[PDB]
Every structure is written in structure tokens, then in C-alpha cells.
RNA sequence: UGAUGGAGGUAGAGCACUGUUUGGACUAGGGGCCCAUCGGGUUACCGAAUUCAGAUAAACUCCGAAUGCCAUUCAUUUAU
């Protein structure tokens, strides 16, 4: 359904895969909170940036 | 980022060829004498006529890949 997200860490340091996946979340500042709904898209934008974000699934 | 279609010989085991290669069988027949002044060239090297196994590459390979790249009146998010 929908997704809950959350940046933990931060860009710095990282290559423009995720710098771009990132931005094109609407991620910022760090512990910043965004909610998207469950698409087959937006999973795989998580799965490129499984370490840097946690999900939760609300 | 997800989905779909395709372009192309990189990572090497691999006796498809090109060169490099180690053992065994085998003979087409030859090693100064043949053994001899017509039958076994003989112990032995035996390749190519053959063939049983094993090695190997950057300029050796019918065939790949990891989405890397190019494309789509396609999908979601974002702002170029």
C-alpha cells in the first residue's frame, strides 16, 4: 500500500546513482520523512538505496 | 528507477580452426649396414595416412555475460 522513507545517513561520499534516486525522492536533510505509495517503481528506487534509508510500512 | 525489444565477443574450463604442446597404440614407410650378391629392415625415432588420452592465449575461439549503453505516444516520483 504505502511506504514510509526515512534518510538515516547521509549523501556525502556516495556516486550519482544515489544522489539522483535521492533527490528524486524529495529527501533533503537528514531524518527528513517522506510517504509514497507502493509502486513497483518505488521499490526498486529502495532497493538501490537500502543502506542509506529505512522503510516502514504503514 | 520498473517493464519490453535489440545492438556486441569482455570475464575461460572448451582435441570447432590458427600457432605452442606431453604420454600411449599404430605403421605408409624408410634409419651407414638391411638380416641379405625370394622371406623377417629389424633393437629403435616414428609424424603426416590414422587414433586414445591430457595442456594452453593479447594480436586463437558455433555461444553467452553483471542491464553498462541506445530506444518506447508505456508506468510512478521528481525538476529540469
Do not use: C, Y
Amino acid at each position: 500500500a504505502e511506504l514510509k522513507i526515512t534518510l538515516k545517513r547521509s549523501v556525502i561520499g556516495r556516486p550519482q546513482n544515489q544522489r539522483a534516486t535521492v533527490k528524486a525522492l524529495g529527501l533533503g536533510k537528514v531524518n527528513s520523512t517522506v510517504t509514497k505509495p507502493a509502486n513497483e517503481a518505488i521499490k526498486g528506487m529502495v532497493n538501490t538505496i537500502s543502506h542509506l534509508v529505512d522503510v516502514e510500512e504503514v
